[PDB]
A = this chain, B = another copy of it.
Amino acid sequence: SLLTMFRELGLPLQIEQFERGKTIFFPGDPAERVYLLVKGAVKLSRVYESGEEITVALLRENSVFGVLSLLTGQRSDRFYHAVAFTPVQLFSVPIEFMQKALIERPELANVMLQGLSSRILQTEMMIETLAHRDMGSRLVSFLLILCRDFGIPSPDGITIDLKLSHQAIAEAIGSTRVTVTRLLGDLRESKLIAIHKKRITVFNPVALSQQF
């Protein structure tokens, strides 16, 4: 629905391309827009003064984001950094176009609430991950998400279909790459995952998610 609903928000709405690594919005940018991710993945990050980054969200296809604009009151400015972790296609409705269309087609409000509901549950899902202690468990919990979100079927299990640098992972699970490398290595030795061409394939993903 979301995809269909967002198309009709206007002449119709054209998609925007962003190339891998291009910023969808910067800290400071007025929160005047709501987005729908259609193709690709988007990385929501907090950027500390030191230039260092922490990942808050690796949004999956069909995700509503830029949600701070939906809040009424003093015009708010972005505080996270939205970047195209893959090549991505989104819609970028201005906030006032949206508000209008929620009044005219109340069906869009039901569909919108559902998407925000999934965002809350997906983000909580992530808290569960970080709330582990063992960085091996934290990593595995993270991978089991990425399997659910970006994974395609493989002979033995699911291959996480996106290019994940160990650094990118480290930023997502509150660790450092050398730990992420080391740990991923340990999964490889245990024969729980396998990597070819920077693509992590977890075996029996069902069996790992049972351990929680």
- Interface 1/0 per residue, A53-97 and B, CB below 8 Å: 011110000000001101111000000100000000000000000
Residue of B with least CB distance to A174: B131
Listed in ascending order, the chain A residues whose CB lies under 8 Å from chain B are: 44, 46, 48, 54-57, 67-68, 70-73, 80, 99, 102-103, 106, 109-110, 112-114, 116-121, 123-124, 126-128, 130-133, 171-176, 212
11 contacts between A and B (CB under 8 A): A54-B131, A57-B124, A67-B116, A70-B114, A71-B114, A71-B118, A71-B121, A80-B124, A109-B112, A112-B113, A132-B174
Contact call A121/B212, Cβ cutoff below 8 A = no
User: Contacts A56-B128, A123-B123 given: A113-B117 contact, CB under 8 Å?
Assistant: no
User: Contacts A56-B131, A119-B120, A124-B56 given: A113-B70 contact, CB under 8 Å?
Assistant: yes
Residue of B with least CB distance to A64: B120
Contact call A110/B71, Cβ cutoff below 8 A = no
Residue of B with least CB distance to A49: B212
Contact call B72/A110, Cβ cutoff below 8 A = yes
